[PDB]
Design a protein around this ligand. Sequence first.
Ligand code: HEC
Ligand code: HEM
Ligand code: HEM
Lengths: 22, 373, 238, 48, 98, 35, 76, 66
Amino acid sequence: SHTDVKVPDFSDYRRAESSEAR
Amino acid sequence: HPLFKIINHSFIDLPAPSNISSWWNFGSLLGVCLMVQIITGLFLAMHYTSDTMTAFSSVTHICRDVNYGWLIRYMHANGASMFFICLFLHVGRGLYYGSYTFMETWNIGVLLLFAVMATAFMGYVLPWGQMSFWGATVITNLLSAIPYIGTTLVEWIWGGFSVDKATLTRFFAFHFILPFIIAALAIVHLLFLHETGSNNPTGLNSDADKIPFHPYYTIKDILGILIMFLILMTLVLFFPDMLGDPDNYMPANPLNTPPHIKPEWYFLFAYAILRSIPNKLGGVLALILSILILALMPFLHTSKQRSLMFRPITQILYWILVANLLILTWIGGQPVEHPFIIIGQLASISYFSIILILMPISGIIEDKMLKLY
Amino acid sequence: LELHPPSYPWSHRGLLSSLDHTSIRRGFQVYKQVCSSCHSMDYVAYRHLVGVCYTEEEAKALAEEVEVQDGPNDDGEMFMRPGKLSDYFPKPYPNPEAARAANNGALPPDLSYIVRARHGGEDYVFSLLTGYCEPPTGVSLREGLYFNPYFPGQAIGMAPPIYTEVLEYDDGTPATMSQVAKDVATFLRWASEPEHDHRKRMGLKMLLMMGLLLPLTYAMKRHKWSVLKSRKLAYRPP
Amino acid sequence: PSRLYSLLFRRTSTFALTIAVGALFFERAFDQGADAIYEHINEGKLWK
Amino acid sequence: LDGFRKWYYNAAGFNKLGLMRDDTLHETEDVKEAIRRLPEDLYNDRMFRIKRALDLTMRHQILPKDQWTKYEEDKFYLEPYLKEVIRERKEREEWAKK
Amino acid sequence: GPRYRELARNWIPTAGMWGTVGAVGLVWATDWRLI
Amino acid sequence: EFGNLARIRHVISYSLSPFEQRAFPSYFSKGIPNVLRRTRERILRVAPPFVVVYLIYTWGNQEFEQSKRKNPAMYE
Amino acid sequence: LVDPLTTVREHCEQLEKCVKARERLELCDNRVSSRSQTEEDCTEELFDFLHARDHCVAHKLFKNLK
Ligand code: HEC
Ligand code: HEM
Ligand code: HEM
């Protein structure tokens, strides 16, 4: 169905309170 | 809102392919270059005088006494050169990626190319230097080729027995008026395209993957505009006379003729072809075909794949075509003597044989390799 | 077939390198004392100098040092007056033919844009002025000619105008033929492009502004294009 | 700094004010700095 | 000839984007009629393959070598459907001349 | 084929008429005296 | 326009916010490998032709000069 | 006063590359001497010699120049 898989990892993309700065 | 409807349709909510490379920037650059030329041309027109006694004096007055007039003049000249660079790369993109199957867009394009070449020729005649006068005479006498209609027609443009003030003034009027016709033809060019949408480098139907234009291909066009402005200014402010010719800084002497005469770089490929054909008429015709062969291009597509991304043999033939186009550009520069002539003759033969014969046969062979033919 | 003048290490040869204004002043002195007898710097007026190598009042001095006629007078044609800062440099041989006659058929070419009009002008100029060497065997120049390996045809009507110590530089820099040819090549260059210096400053500001603006616009494009460049597509047939 | 976002970036109006004001002064600084360079590069050759 | 056809298939490079041969055909009128006659699953796989190839061309990437389309594996699915379109097209044409 | 042949034969006469008009038009406009 | 462009089915598409992702993820990390990957894929189909151009160019220039060169036997 | 060019010239001139070049010119000069009744000249030889000489001088005249 729609739950078989989870959102793919974006760790090599995702950056590492912070939103304001970002 | 009626206008906003139109605005949103051609620049904001226009569905564009997501994978078009930087080559698709170039046409927008051409439009920017057109406006730049028009703007600089307008600021040349407030001080230029189209009189043979005062044209060179007015150009020197622009360069020496008008505040930043040298800047606007050399921006106009190097912007014409940048216009032809972007035009050649736009045409090469259209040839490589199979964009000529948009036939109406392609034909409005080749009309625009003819108009831009005529505008640049008369604009180069306009400063009334030594090189401008002998170039005009030469390029105009070319029209004297036609047996019954030609001779009179030439003096008709010359407006007299030989190019003289009569020409300069009417060349100023034409050169003023044709870029607005180019702008209208570019509007028709954009219309005939939105009906079909732009092509992508894979040559496939990109309807499954289209994105907006405002945030994706606008900032990309802004970046391309910035890079093109970097190259123009660094070709005006640091190397201002690189693309020009020194003999144009002498006044027009009808009694003398510049010893080494050559068209500007962009018009050379044609120059080579003209010189190559022994017959005068033949040269003129071939010359025309040189540009026109492109229009003829959408009827020569014999492949089942639109683009050359998956077609290596026709890629090799395309780069050989770019190679001998560069060769013809070099030959035009070289004087009349061995062996420049033979190369010119071959290079022209190879150019017409690759466009006319070799690419459809290669496309048939490529279709045979994929078990399609 | 022509000798191709070599490349000389000019002080303005570099990408951001301006002109040496003392050399332009010395070359203007060289033109005024030697070259102005036959050649006409038509497009350079005394006023032009102000700001380059001569100050306003200073230029006025030079201006006041020439007689320029004023054609329209109540009943007369010419009481050449003290040339002003608005007067253009005085062209010798008011009519072209006059010079033709004086120079034996040759027409000194107005040296306002000579450097720009001659291929590799600065070099050519220097070479021509300093290329007055010995004619070779078999050569038969016509009456009133001289031998310079560079000039087209190697037959320039112009006789060699720069003999060592031809004129004395007011600055006192030894007036060797070369020091004089280099100064007049710098000056003629300036003449053919009075804005050389101003431009290069604009080009430096342009390079600094593009070096600031290109990575920032690239970063904005890569922000607005990251979204897609990270998009992950997945096909999930039911 | 989260003061920036709150004071400069957050409201378009504020986002603008900072740009215009900065640009007003940037010219002063840029011209000054740039001129220093240009001149020095050719310090010897210039009227004075 | 078989090995040289595999070498040309590698040199063409649409297998590196995961495409089939019939995905690379230019959509003329006959090709669009053949695409319209496809079953739903084949059409959906073709549209997903084209979208993935466009995304890969956007990011200037290719698939990993294990995910490429093996020449031997490529299936000419549109071909059968296409021949018919051409056959029908020609028949109508000759009849026109009648 | 045969049908298109019929079509051509049927329109060529009309076409010739059109060309004729053009002949008069071009000549009259060109004022070519040879004609 | 959008909405009537094409018909796809069951193609899920995930994405991230610009400010949430690094601006230049591994820019030189993989950029270099990729640029190099790319060149080797078209270099054999682009350069070869232009190489021969450099060659014809050179040969042409040299040949011309030789033509201008005085014939030793000439006049002797 | 000695024009710097003369110095620079002397230097580059002394070079053998140039010396033999001049010599080749000499043979040419002489050829025309004996082969006086012809149309062959030494212009071409002259230029090549100079191109070399000047190139070098040019490489080194501006330094001396002030
Ligand atoms: C008494 C005559 C005379 C004097 C003095 C003279 N010239 Fe000339 N010059 C000419 C003539 C005549 C020509 C054109 C002759 C020709 O081109 O065959 C000429 C041409 C030139 C040219 C262009 C040559 C070309 O190829 O078009 C330059 C540059 C030049 N002169 C520089 C100078 C400089 C610098 C001086 C002095 C510092 C100078 N001249 C003094 C007579 C003179
Ligand atoms: C006046 C100069 C020209 C300008 C300003 C111009 C501009 C453009 C622009 C903005 C586009 C849209 C594509 C894009 O930007 O991504 C385009 C597309 C196109 N142009 Fe041009 N063009 C010019 C000359 C030509 C010429 C001479 C030809 C023919 C050789 C031509 C053929 C095409 C074709 C076929 C397309 C469709 C390609 C596509 O978008 O995928 N154009 N042009
Ligand atoms: C309405 C738009 C345009 C106007 C009003 C205009 C006006 C002028 C004027 C007055 C001149 C003479 C001044 C001078 O040469 O310095 C000129 C020169 C020139 N124009 Fe244009 N122009 C326009 C568009 C174009 C376009 C589209 C091109 C390119 C095709 C072009 C190319 C040139 C060239 C090459 C010169 C000669 C440059 C030189 O002197 O070296 N112009 N223009």
